[PDB]
Amino acid sequence: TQLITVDEKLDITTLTGVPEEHIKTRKARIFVPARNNMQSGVNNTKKWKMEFDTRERWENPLMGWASTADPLSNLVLTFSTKEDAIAFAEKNGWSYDVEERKVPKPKSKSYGANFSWNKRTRVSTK
Amino acid sequence: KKTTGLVGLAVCETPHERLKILYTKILDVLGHIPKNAAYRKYTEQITNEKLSIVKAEPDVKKLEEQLQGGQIEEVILQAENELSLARKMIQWKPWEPLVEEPPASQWKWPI
Amino acid sequence: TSVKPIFSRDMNEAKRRVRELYRAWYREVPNTVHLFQLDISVKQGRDKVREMFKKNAHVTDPRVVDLLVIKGKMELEETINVWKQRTHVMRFFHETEAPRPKDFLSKFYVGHDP
Amino acid sequence: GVRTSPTGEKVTHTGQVYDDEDYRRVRFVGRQKEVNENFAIDLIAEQPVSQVGSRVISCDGGGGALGHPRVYINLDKETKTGTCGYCGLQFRQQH
Amino acid sequence: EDNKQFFGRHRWVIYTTEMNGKNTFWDVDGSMVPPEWHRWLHCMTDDP
Amino acid sequence: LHHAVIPHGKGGRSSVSGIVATVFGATGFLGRYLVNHLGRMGSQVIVPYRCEPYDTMHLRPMGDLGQIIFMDWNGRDKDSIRRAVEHSNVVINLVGREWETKNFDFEDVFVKIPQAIAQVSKEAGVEKFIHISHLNADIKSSSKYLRNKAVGEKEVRETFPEATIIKPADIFGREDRFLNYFANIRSLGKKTVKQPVYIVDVTKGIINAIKDPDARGKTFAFVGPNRYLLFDLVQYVFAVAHRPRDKVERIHTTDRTLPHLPGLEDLGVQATPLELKAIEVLRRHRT
Amino acid sequence: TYKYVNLREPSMDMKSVTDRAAQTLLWTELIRGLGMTLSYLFREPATINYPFEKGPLSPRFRGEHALRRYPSGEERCIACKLCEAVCPAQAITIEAEPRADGSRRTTRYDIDMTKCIYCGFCQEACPVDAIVEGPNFEFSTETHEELLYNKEKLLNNGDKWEAEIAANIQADYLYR
Amino acid sequence: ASATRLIQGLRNWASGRDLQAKLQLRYQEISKRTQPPPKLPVGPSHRLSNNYYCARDGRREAMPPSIVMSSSEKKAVSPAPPIKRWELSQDEPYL
Amino acid sequence: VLRLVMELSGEMVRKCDPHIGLLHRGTEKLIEYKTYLQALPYFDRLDYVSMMCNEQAYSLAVEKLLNIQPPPRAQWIRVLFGEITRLLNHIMAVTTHALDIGAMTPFFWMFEEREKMFEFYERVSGARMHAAYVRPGGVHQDLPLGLMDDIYEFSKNFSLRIDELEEMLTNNRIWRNRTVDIGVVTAEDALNYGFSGVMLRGSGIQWDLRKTQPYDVYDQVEFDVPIGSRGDCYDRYLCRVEEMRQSIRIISQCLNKMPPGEIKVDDAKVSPPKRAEMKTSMESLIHHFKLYTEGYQVPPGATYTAIEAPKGEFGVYLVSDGSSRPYRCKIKAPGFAHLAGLDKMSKGHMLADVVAIIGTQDIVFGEVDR
Amino acid sequence: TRPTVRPRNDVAHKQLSAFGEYVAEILPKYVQQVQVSCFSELEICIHPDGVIPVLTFLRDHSNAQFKSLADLTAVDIPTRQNRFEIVYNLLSLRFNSRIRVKTYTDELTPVESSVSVYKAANWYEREIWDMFGVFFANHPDLRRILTDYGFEGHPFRKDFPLSGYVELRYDDEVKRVVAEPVELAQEFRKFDLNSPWEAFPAYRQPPE
Numbered sequence A: 001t002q003l004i005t006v007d008e009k010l011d012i013t014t015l016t017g018v019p020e021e022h023i024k025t026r027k028a029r030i031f032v033p034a035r036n037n038m039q040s041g042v043n044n045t046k047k048w049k050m051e052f053d054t055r056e057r058w059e060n061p062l063m064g065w066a067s068t069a070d071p072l073s074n075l076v077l078t079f080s081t082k083e084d085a086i087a088f089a090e091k092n093g094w095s096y097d098v099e100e101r102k103v104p105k106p107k108s109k110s111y112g113a114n115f116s117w118n119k120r121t122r123v124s125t126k
Numbered sequence B: 001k002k003t004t005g006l007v008g009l010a011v012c013e014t015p016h017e018r019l020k021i022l023y024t025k026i027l028d029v030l031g032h033i034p035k036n037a038a039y040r041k042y043t044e045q046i047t048n049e050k051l052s053i054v055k056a057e058p059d060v061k062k063l064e065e066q067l068q069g070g071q072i073e074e075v076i077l078q079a080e081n082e083l084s085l086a087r088k089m090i091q092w093k094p095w096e097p098l099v100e101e102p103p104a105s106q107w108k109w110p111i
Numbered sequence C: 001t002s003v004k005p006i007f008s009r010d011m012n013e014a015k016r017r018v019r020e021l022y023r024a025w026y027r028e029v030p031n032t033v034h035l036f037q038l039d040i041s042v043k044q045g046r047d048k049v050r051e052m053f054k055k056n057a058h059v060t061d062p063r064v065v066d067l068l069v070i071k072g073k074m075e076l077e078e079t080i081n082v083w084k085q086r087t088h089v090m091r092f093f094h095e096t097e098a099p100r101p102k103d104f105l106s107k108f109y110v111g112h113d114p
Numbered sequence D: 001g002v003r004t005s006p007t008g009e010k011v012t013h014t015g016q017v018y019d020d021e022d023y024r025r026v027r028f029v030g031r032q033k034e035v036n037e038n039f040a041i042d043l044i045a046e047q048p049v050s051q052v053g054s055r056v057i058s059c060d061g062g063g064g065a066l067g068h069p070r071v072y073i074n075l076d077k078e079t080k081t082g083t084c085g086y087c088g089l090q091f092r093q094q095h
Numbered sequence E: 001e002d003n004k005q006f007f008g009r010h011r012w013v014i015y016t017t018e019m020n021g022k023n024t025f026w027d028v029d030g031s032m033v034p035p036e037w038h039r040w041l042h043c044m045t046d047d048p
Numbered sequence F: 001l002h003h004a005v006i007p008h009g010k011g012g013r014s015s016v017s018g019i020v021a022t023v024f025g026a027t028g029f030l031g032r033y034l035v036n037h038l039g040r041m042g043s044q045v046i047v048p049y050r051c052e053p054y055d056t057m058h059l060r061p062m063g064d065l066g067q068i069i070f071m072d073w074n075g076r077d078k079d080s081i082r083r084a085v086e087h088s089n090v091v092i093n094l095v096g097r098e099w100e101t102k103n104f105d106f107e108d109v110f111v112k113i114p115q116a117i118a119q120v121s122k123e124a125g126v127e128k129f130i131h132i133s134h135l136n137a138d139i140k141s142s143s144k145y146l147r148n149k150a151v152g153e154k155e156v157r158e159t160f161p162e163a164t165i166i167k168p169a170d171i172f173g174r175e176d177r178f179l180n181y182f183a184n185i186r187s188l189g190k191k192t193v194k195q196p197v198y199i200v201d202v203t204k205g206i207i208n209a210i211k212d213p214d215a216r217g218k219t220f221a222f223v224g225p226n227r228y229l230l231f232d233l234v235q236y237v238f239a240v241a242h243r244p245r246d247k248v249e250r251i252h253t254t255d256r257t258l259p260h261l262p263g264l265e266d267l268g269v270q271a272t273p274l275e276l277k278a279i280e281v282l283r284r285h286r287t
Numbered sequence G: 001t002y003k004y005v006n007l008r009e010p011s012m013d014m015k016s017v018t019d020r021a022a023q024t025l026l027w028t029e030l031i032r033g034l035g036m037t038l039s040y041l042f043r044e045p046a047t048i049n050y051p052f053e054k055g056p057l058s059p060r061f062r063g064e065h066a067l068r069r070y071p072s073g074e075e076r077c078i079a080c081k082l083c084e085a086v087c088p089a090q091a092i093t094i095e096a097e098p099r100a101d102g103s104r105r106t107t108r109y110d111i112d113m114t115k116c117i118y119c120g121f122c123q124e125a126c127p128v129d130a131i132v133e134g135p136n137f138e139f140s141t142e143t144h145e146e147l148l149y150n151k152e153k154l155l156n157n158g159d160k161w162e163a164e165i166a167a168n169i170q171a172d173y174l175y176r
Numbered sequence H: 001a002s003a004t005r006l007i008q009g010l011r012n013w014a015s016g017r018d019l020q021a022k023l024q025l026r027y028q029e030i031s032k033r034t035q036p037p038p039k040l041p042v043g044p045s046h047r048l049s050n051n052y053y054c055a056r057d058g059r060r061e062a063m064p065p066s067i068v069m070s071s072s073e074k075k076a077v078s079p080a081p082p083i084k085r086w087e088l089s090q091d092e093p094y095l
Numbered sequence I: 001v002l003r004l005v006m007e008l009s010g011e012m013v014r015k016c017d018p019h020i021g022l023l024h025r026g027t028e029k030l031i032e033y034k035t036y037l038q039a040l041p042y043f044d045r046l047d048y049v050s051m052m053c054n055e056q057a058y059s060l061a062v063e064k065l066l067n068i069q070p071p072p073r074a075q076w077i078r079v080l081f082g083e084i085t086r087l088l089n090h091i092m093a094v095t096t097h098a099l100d101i102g103a104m105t106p107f108f109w110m111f112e113e114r115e116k117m118f119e120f121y122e123r124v125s126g127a128r129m130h131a132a133y134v135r136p137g138g139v140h141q142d143l144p145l146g147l148m149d150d151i152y153e154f155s156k157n158f159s160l161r162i163d164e165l166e167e168m169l170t171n172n173r174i175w176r177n178r179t180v181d182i183g184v185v186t187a188e189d190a191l192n193y194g195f196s197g198v199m200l201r202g203s204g205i206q207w208d209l210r211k212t213q214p215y216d217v218y219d220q221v222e223f224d225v226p227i228g229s230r231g232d233c234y235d236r237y238l239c240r241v242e243e244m245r246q247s248i249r250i251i252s253q254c255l256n257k258m259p260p261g262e263i264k265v266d267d268a269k270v271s272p273p274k275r276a277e278m279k280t281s282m283e284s285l286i287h288h289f290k291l292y293t294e295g296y297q298v299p300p301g302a303t304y305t306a307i308e309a310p311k312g313e314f315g316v317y318l319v320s321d322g323s324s325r326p327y328r329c330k331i332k333a334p335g336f337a338h339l340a341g342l343d344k345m346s347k348g349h350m351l352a353d354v355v356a357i358i359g360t361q362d363i364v365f366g367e368v369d370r
Numbered sequence J: 001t002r003p004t005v006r007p008r009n010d011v012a013h014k015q016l017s018a019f020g021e022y023v024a025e026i027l028p029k030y031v032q033q034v035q036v037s038c039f040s041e042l043e044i045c046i047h048p049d050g051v052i053p054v055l056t057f058l059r060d061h062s063n064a065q066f067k068s069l070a071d072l073t074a075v076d077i078p079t080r081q082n083r084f085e086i087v088y089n090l091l092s093l094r095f096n097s098r099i100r101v102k103t104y105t106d107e108l109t110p111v112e113s114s115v116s117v118y119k120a121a122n123w124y125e126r127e128i129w130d131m132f133g134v135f136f137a138n139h140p141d142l143r144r145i146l147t148d149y150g151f152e153g154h155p156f157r158k159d160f161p162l163s164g165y166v167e168l169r170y171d172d173e174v175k176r177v178v179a180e181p182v183e184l185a186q187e188f189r190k191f192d193l194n195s196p197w198e199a200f201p202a203y204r205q206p207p208e
């Protein structure tokens, strides 16, 4: 009913329940997932994925497997903006690294200049 | 009638005068409400239409098949319930304009 | 920037509720060690109770302190009844080591944890 | 059609056998290390390489909709045999 | 194979002794039948 | 060393630790708790057994999915035991019954058994062979059990000289013989000095000695902290239990100290006294 | 459209009320229930004599997890990982290597029979129909190690029989 | 079946429902297996020259949801009209 | 198996808290970390006694979001198996009520009937119980030839056997005197406490999802859903019995008017193509391959649907980001909604009547847990 | 279009449009959105203050009965300042229509405990308190349903991973079942399946 409210930071790491080692040791990475180059499509772009650093994955010697003692290793969080990404990573407690976004720079390609006269641009095959 | 199809509903014996004094109380408690709202308009409209249905009906089954809400006493039950929300809508000020907006990046779904 | 608080206005009622909850947990323990037939003296149980209170001793948001009051009160209800069996009350303790130390050297011989 | 390890047991179709300083040999103690003793490498060489009298041919593998899908392979290698990746068997050409 | 009984008592096996050399006069097992009789015995067909 | 023998990552429950341990006996008490701590460590334990597989069935699932392995042996054939310890890192000798059977005396178990298995283990070439004995088992009289343990100590020190001879005091736990024997009595009153030690400290000492390096040769003896009168201990047993010939001579012999050889202080573990763990284990009295 | 139960009244004719009171005092329809149960007593019991008369089944039962192979030929699988992708329990585990023949092959092909929920997605997802839900359902495994199958256990399981699996697939290659 | 008439009459007397007629032990009308193979017909596609996927593309016809609000009006209609009351079925009502 | 904590004045009550959640399995999070077609058997087996109506509800959820109508032969076959599942679940509810109350043998008679129904499931899909078999986008791998005669013979024999069950129980005096007096349901409480299905059919008001909102061709089969009279456990039992009888009538009309249409949709980007064209096409192999790796893309939006499982309003609420994975499913369970009102059903009775209340609402706790 | 595609009924579309416009114009105090889907099931998007007045208005008023309450789930969405979504679902007995009342909420500020007006929301509020952390203000009994007692962490969040942080096992040392930090037996490969190339052109959001 429009009460006393203070406008401060949050400390939700006490309430999310995950213990201290998995809170303060692993470091998040907020990145835009790069384009898988064997395809050419940037629909898989336009999101900010938060992931964690990988840790040890040994060989289970009975079947030849990959077991691990890592519950946080297989997360990914899809975000819409870097601002809410950093706000969430500072809300929930753990340390983090933020990279920036890289785009294809707009070029100026033209078939008519690919069939030039006195420039060295010449397709030599078509 | 005798012991209608519902279970937890003891039948009535004088439906008409009971329903009429219920709807007069509906119109009065609506009379408490300020005129400038639209809730007064729409509830006055629908309740006086139903009252005009009942004034042309001294029967029971023709009253149940001109007006919906089968069979009979659920109409009285929801009339009491609408009187209850009328009493609650003296409070709660719903005609007053909007409380503060969402931050406008929220309801856009496909994320 | 208007937020409805849970229970408290400032930290005064937060401190009052959390010391009330600590008083209840102090007078609640010997009933549990008499009822569930535990294997641990009263001193060690009270020391880990005050350890768990002292672990989160630096949170100043009153909403969060009220919500931890609600958490501790739910666990106090479910331990003052006979619902939570011997396994959960022993699960609060850590006697199944896990002796994993916090050196650098012993963390180096069992590596990949800097 | 199997080999035999110098330790004294049967190797698989993959050369995965153990050294002397292991312990999965000692969890093999008492119960038999199974191995399918009918391999797949040597069963190709017992097949007759068919000599089809056309240029570019087809392969299904013994039965329509029971086997692998249609692959049309080329036989233009004048001394090498065209190999189906599914079937694993060879062909030639004779005009 | 009989037809005079109901569906479930059409076909029944009777095992012999020492089919592996294991003295199976007693303690008869499942999977002691070869697989074409396993197609026939479970009533997946009518042809022996 | 080949791969998948080195440790990997964290500890236990398919986290592969370093050791590969072959445990003899391991049907009864102390072998069961030691197999439990090695399953907590997450190793591979070769346990052979001669008895019925129901007993190793009840102590079976303490290891992880297919980590521990079960096999067979006897007290007569060297070849089956050599087959059992073909491929192993370490081997521990924990065998011995506290009464003569019809087929085996205290003769030839403590006498024949460690010589044969230590012989075939030295012929196999393993490390850190850990052999149990009792404290104060000298050459002297009043117990065939104690003099045969003295002979066995002489055997294990004589052949395969870098064997770790280990000895605890009278050890108590959930399925003890002497403490539950004092619980399940009837009576007589005498005097004897004695120290007990709770079983998890002994087996944590054994696992720390078996994974920590270069402690071979030096025989160890496990010392409880209390070290007081047997009669006060028996009155303590009747007090906590609320109710007011070979084994009785082996408990009325004595328990004296041999302080020259070290204990748990060169190993770094708490030794738990009688009060806490005894109130823990002394259930099942009246009501 | 509705048809509701229990709308009558107990009658006021003396004959009807004395028939109901005769039912009350004389245990009548209880005895009629005894008569119904004795009428099912004198039937013949529909039990199958289990180890000699095994139960009826389908042409398309989902059982044994046996691989197949080509007519007078090599292994049918490719290691194309479609079964591992569709496996909802994620019990399929594949590691592939090609061999000296040039054609692509495997190294490791493990099914976790503990985890396998026996759907049919790997039966219907294999483009060459290499892995097939087998005919028989008799596993009954003592240890926990033995319920983890290797490629060689699957191939010996598919070479102890194929003529059964070939008969089933040749019976119903038209529906799926 | 496979019983005499005396115990048959005792069955039909202990429950007067003619138990010999239908008994839930099937002998004859077990469906005769090894059926002939089917030829499955294909429905409203494989129709050549008209099957345009631009036409029947119901996936791409998924409209975004239409929004009506923000952050003497003859109105106040119900969402759907009220449901007509049922009747007893003629097929054996009560009472 | 449930936990119950009852605080009671003696051979009576004061309060009764059903502690449940013991059979919790992480189903919603596990569906969140998978695709649609991979995570279909979760909705097959969260409820486990009913086994094809749950699949029908999840298939209708994905079809109603995806805007694809199945071909009509698939719809009529789906109707047939929905009525088989309804018959099976109601007869198991009756027989486990009878076995928990005592009453040893009709349990076994009707489980002989249910063994024949598992034989029908075997001949259709192949597995014993958990027929996946209902893809979103139409039914997969239609029934083999030589089945409808078996279903018709079963329909006659089961009509006679359900009449003989009504002979056995049902005007048995002491089972009636066991369950008449107990467990009234006020219609006001029947609407507030969120009861569904057989509770709404028994406790007064006329309400059938099948008759009101046809989620499939049910508007073209002729039957009548039974109504209760006094909101009562014997009355609710008779309601279950006549729902079984009308399921038999729907099986009769469905076997009368089956069309020879088609198995799956002709939409090869949603349902996989059949095997012959898969072996000889190109687009069939491409659609097969990418459909079984990624799963088909699904437009964004939040849908809700609900059908009549034999316990009641089985509701499934899909939330889909535009992707091949469901972003969040959720299940409204009639068993959970029924068990919510245990205080207002057992406010004035004793513990044997409490076991009767647990009987008269078909709890299974695979579904009551979500 | 005419086969293989479920048609839509624009009669019900116009009816639900007019009804939602009616409700939105007669309760201006708490309404932000009334959106209609293609398949005609209404969604009403609401500020977290008027929960009790909107539910009391939507239980009664005789232009819309909606006596029937169904599920409540608060599906967790990051990249929103107020994260969680309370989804009431309301069904009319007389009218055969479904309205999804979506009110938004944050991590800490409570919504106003709908158990007082709908008795079917008791275990719903208790369950969503256990699984999420959405507190309900002036509710009688708040306990843990569908979790273990000693467990905590609110596991249907997105920050809680798929495998939990605990792993039970029996041991004979302490003669009981104890919890250790988690040790998997296989990795649980979370595959990459987000393929590019924009399968739905009609849902292209406007970029920055």
Ligand SMILES: NC(=O)C1=CN([C@@H]2O[C@H](COP(=O)(O)OP(=O)(O)OC[C@H]3O[C@@H](n4cnc5c(N)ncnc54)[C@H](OP(=O)(O)O)[C@@H]3O)[C@@H](O)[C@H]2O)C=CC1
Residues within 6 Å of the ligand: F024, F025, F026, F027, F028, F029, F030, F031, F049, F050, F051, F052, F055, F075, F094, F095, F096, F097, F098, F104, F109, F132, F133, F134, F135, F168, F169, F170, F171, F177
């Ligand atoms: N006070 C104490 O308890 C102390 C005990 N110890 C030693 O600890 C060990 C374990 O103690 P305890 O509780 O008695 O457990 P056990 O007596 O059960 O352990 C002895 C093991 O040897 C096996 N065994 C028995 N008879 C023979 C035989 N004739 N040949 C070969 N193996 C045999 C036993 O059964 P199985 O055949 O089924 O494997 C068992 O596995 C003993 O060796 C004991 O000397 C040492 C110091 C103090």
Ligand code: SF4
Residues within 6 Å of the ligand: G076, G077, G078, G079, G080, G081, G082, G083, G084, G094, G125, G126, G127, G128, G129, G130, G131
């Ligand atoms: S789908 Fe078939 S060919 Fe592909 S990996 Fe699996 S078994 Fe092999």
Ligand code: SF4
Residues within 6 Å of the ligand: G083, G086, G087, G088, G089, G090, G091, G092, G111, G115, G116, G117, G118, G119, G120, G121, G122, G123
């Ligand atoms: S039947 Fe299902 S769970 Fe089993 S291996 Fe095949 S796809 Fe995986």
Ligand SMILES: [Zn+2]
Residues within 6 Å of the ligand: D059, D060, D061, D068, D071, D084, D085, D086, D087, D088
């Ligand atoms: Zn080929």
